[PDB]
């Protein structure tokens, strides 16, 4: 029973770290969307200009 | 998408394994254990608890109380022979 208990003890603290970290990462991808639109506009502009 | 909350919900690992059942047994049993027993019964000096102390110990399988007790009945009826004769 002590063996079972020891696993759970360590988990309880450390999991909270991952919990935060995971959402933090997701936030970064939101910001990446703003980038994506910047990238997009540049690509489009270069293409129209290339045709000219 | 955000990580789900399963890892942090533990309250069904408190009955979830079999030694929880054993635990709730021996947290009572061993806690209510005495260092040594209450007493084994061997003597008490009622003057026949002494008979038990000499003869009817935990380790005495020695035939001596049997012999003594047998001889007692021999002493009983032998006198009764002379009560009837």
**Residue of A2, A4, A11 best to disrupt the B interface, most CBs of B under 10 A:** A4
Question: What experimental approach yielded this model?
Answer: cryo-EM
Please tell me the distance from the alpha carbon of residue B9 to that of residue A12, in angstroms, as a whole number. 9
Q: Taking CB atoms and an 8 Å cutoff, what residues of chain A touch B17?
A: 1, 4
Please tell me the distance from the alpha carbon of residue A45 to that of residue A42, in angstroms, as a whole number. 5
Smallest CA–CA distance from B24 into chain A, residue? A1
Helices (DSSP H) in chain B: which residue ranges?
A: 19-29, 49-55, 64-81
Q: Under a CB-based contact definition with an 8 Å cutoff, are residues A12 and B8 in contact?
A: yes
Q: Under a CB-based contact definition with an 8 Å cutoff, are residues B62 and B55 in contact?
A: yes
Residues 6+ apart with CB under 8 A from B15: B21
Structure tokens at A4: 């079972």
**Contact across the interface for A4 and B8, Cβ inside 8 Å:** no
Please tell me the distance from the alpha carbon of residue B7 to that of residue A18, in angstroms, as a whole number. 11
């Amino acid at each position: 029973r002590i063996d079972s208990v020891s696993q759970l003890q360590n988990v309880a603290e450390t999991t909270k770290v991952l919990f935060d970290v995971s959402k933090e990462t997701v936030e970064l991808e939101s910001e990446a969307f703003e980038l994506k639109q910047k990238v997009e506009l540049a690509h489009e502009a270069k293409a129209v200009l290339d045709s000219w | 998408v955000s990580t789900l909350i399963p890892p942090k919900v533990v309250s069904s690992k408190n009955i979830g394994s079999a030694p929880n059942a054993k635990r709730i047994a021996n947290v009572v049993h061993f806690y209510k254990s005495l260092p040594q027993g209450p007493a084994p019964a061997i003597k008490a000096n009622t003057r026949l608890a002494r008979y038990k102390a000499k003869y009817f110990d935990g380790d005495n399988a020695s035939g001596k109380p049997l012999w003594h007790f047998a001889l007692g009945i021999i002493a009983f009826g032998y006198s009764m022979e002379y009560y009837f004769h």
